[PDB]
Amino acid sequence: MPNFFIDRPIFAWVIAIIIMLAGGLAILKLPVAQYPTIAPPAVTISASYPGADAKTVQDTVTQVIEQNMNGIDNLMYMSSNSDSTGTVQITLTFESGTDADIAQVQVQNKLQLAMPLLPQEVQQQGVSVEKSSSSFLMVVGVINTDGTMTQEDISDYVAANMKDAISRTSGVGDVQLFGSQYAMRIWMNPNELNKFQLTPVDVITAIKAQNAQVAAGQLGGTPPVKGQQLNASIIAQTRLTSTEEFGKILLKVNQDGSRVLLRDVAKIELGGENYDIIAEFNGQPASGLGIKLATGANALDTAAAIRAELAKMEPFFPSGLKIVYPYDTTPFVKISIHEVVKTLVEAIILVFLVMYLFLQNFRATLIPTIAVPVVLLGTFAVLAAFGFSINTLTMFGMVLAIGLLVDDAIVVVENVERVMAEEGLPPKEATRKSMGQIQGALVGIAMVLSAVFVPMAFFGGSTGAIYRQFSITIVSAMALSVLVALILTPALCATMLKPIAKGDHGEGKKGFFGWFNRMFEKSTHHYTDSVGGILRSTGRYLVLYLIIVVGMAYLFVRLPSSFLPDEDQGVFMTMVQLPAGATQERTQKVLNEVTHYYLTKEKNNVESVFAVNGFGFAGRGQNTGIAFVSLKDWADRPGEENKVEAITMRATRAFSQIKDAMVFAFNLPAIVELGTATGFDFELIDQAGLGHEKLTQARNQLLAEAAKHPDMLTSVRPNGLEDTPQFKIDIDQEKAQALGVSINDINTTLGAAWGGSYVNDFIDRGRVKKVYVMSEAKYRMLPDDIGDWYVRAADGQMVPFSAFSSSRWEYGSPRLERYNGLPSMEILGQAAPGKSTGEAMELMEQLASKLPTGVGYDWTGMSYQERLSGNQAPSLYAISLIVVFLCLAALYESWSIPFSVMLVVPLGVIGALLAATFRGLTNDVYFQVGLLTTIGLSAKNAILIVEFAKDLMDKEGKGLIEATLDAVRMRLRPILMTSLAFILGVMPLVISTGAGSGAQNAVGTGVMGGMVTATVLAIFFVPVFFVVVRRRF
Amino acid sequence: MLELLKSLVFAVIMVPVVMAIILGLIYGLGEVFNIFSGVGKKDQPG
């Protein structure tokens, strides 16, 4: 019935163009971002309780929001972590495939299932449910160059001007801002408050009075009096708009009168809303903003617009303000597009340079110049109807698609020139006859090569999210190949062709080929004593098949089983970890050195040392700094020594020389949606309720068990911070009432002077900013500064905190990390240089099952998706190939042919198990995608062999000998015509060490030796089973 | 526009060289694919 469509010529020329013109729109409708939405949908409930503790920030805030979490809709884990800055990050991560849009809805239908079980200050402080797919877009830093602007001067300028203009640049669906805006920080001065007999109660009370916007109303308001002609709208006290207009905030009656100024007791100034973050970019103060790209993930035209939007703001910048981009996606995206669209077009030209080895013609050879881009632009087109973004995973879903479009078109070409170049008859003799022998085969060529990708397109997890970006891309590469092979190929293999003489395979044509076009077949005629010499006595040649399998079975479990490689992402985060209770001054003092380290020792590589003090991935506070150390292009970073893993090893080694801090220096994971670090993320459970010491000391038994294997487990470290000293102040509460003070004069004094307290809003350049009272810094540093705070009694006399409040010191863990209502302690760690996570995570599983029941081990984050790959990814081969084990019986009409063609499969499995370890690469996800590319290549050639053997017994009547002297001797030539196309499609990748093509050449060399097994081995092993299994069955 | 001049001179040398190492495989080891001569047929079921 596709043969009925052959004799309509221009029907077939241009339906190829239909799939291209729709694909010509697919340029104008595909979002492009190199890592799409592949994370499990997580939700970060970012609370706040400023100045507060950590032992009872989980109890005011977190244990309330944790205790509404009744049966979370398609949940995997809810981890939260309160800390010493009063920050809570409840992280509800859900099942993959569950709608992230309903998630942020349903989290605030789990939180806002049962809100006012909240002590209601939980939401009164300001909580922010957010779909924190913790991938970013560009993480634009904004620095001052000369030094006039401080940090906080920048961070307000960004949030007053940039953020509201960047958060509606298209593609941006989230602007996170760093760190915060200005806020009229009211630094109180307790040796001025005692001078006026005030407390911070009456400092706050006047600011909630005189700085209050009052709905006055209207002259001539509604309803009027009969006889009205005047309408106004009364301005009462506005929100007070400046530092000086808080300066004259009144406190009392003043018969001292220069009316009692709030600027006589409180040093008014602007400043940030928290100072836990000091971001010194190259030792120079900076704000930042972390952009997160919306669904509609078009990272090009967003960043093509954002880098324009910054250039619109460069006229608006004050003195010395500079924009630098520490992290990005696009210089890791842009050249990976424009090469792998050109390489893709080069592979189109390489396919023409395949048949410059085979055809050496113009009009008969111009067929895949049209036939290849139709499968390509249609793969853009159908995925644009199925919602799959241009990324790695569908540009590498198109380079792997090159091997699936050459199996149809170019295979017809020598089957057509089986009649011309080998027999000398017109192409009409090859138009219907040669297609008619394979029209029933392209039923199965389309069948068995889409069949092995069926279960991965439906399986869940991020492993399933990687697969669905691969599988339906190859399926669209398959389904728009058989729908092109049965249309476009016959009208180009019957109409515009050239008559060629008989016996001429290019002998008198351009030198080196003519001596070789015999000599390949002539060595194949010396290989005829291997064609026949294998197939006669097949007894010894069956134990040779186990030699293929013993090499498979031994070099697969010994092959290291990682999950994702370390991508050279152009940045690497260096985190700092001071003693428990070390200040923001000292952590900055180390990030003086580390920036001086990365700008004297590695200035040839390092772009920049955007160094956020205080904040840290895996842990906040003041003892923990981090540096987003960024790199250059690979053209400026040559060789193995200037990749990340060589830099961070030089970093960490010279950081052991750096006193005062365990300064790790690690790399981001491959996909940035999941991990703080790469490697793994060893969580921990409160199984029985062991408390806090043995909670910590089985974790110290863990580093007694897991850090003492230093060869494999490199830098196994905790996340939950060591028990810092906490400063208990025993408000000797009866003295704190017998002296005359009400304790609300005390807890407001003790907790809005030391604390930092929101008061109200104010107006600043027409923008709402917060009003914070706090002590001035030199009056809250020490336990001595307890004694300087004065509280007012009943009778107006002033009492010091040292008169009653007996201070002391205690333990306290700031990062009280929880898990679904269970306290926990997270543990990080990488794997060995040259080894993998699976020989490190299961090594941890040797060292996590050591503990008794009572404190359990959990594997989630990056560690869930590899715990899910360990449960389905080699188990993918079962239900994939058993459908292929049942596809053959439909094609070959026997139970016993699936005993044969299902044993072409481990020929190329060992083809890739060699090419990995011959360069030293691991069993990641892509290696298996290389295997499913390789297994596709093995079964592809068998249909040109074994379905042809089905075809011979009807149309030419051949046993084994006459079959093999015509099947194998002649139909091995089109197998080369796919071999030189696809496997040389990674020829620009063999010499490429840039945008993470390392484990992608183990695919290409793996299919090459898999083609070597297709070159000698696979063209016998079903005819080996013609002399044994067809002898048996 | 330079890598199409690369793939003029480096896709005219790395197409026959990959065609040449397989000749060191399929003709060099193809002779050792015929050094093995014998029968070991596992016809124990038959």
Ligand SMILES: COCCN1CCN(c2nc(SCCc3ccc(OC)c(OC)c3)c(C#N)c3c2COC(C)(C)C3)CC1
């Ligand atoms: C409170 O912070 C929570 C957000 N975390 C995730 C994103 N992370 C990241 N932030 C930045 S830039 C941070 C801008 C900034 C400015 C002022 C600050 O002081 C107020 C400040 O401290 C936070 C940060 C970068 C980069 N480049 C990266 C990450 C993370 O890794 C990348 C590779 C994306 C590079 C910052 C930490």
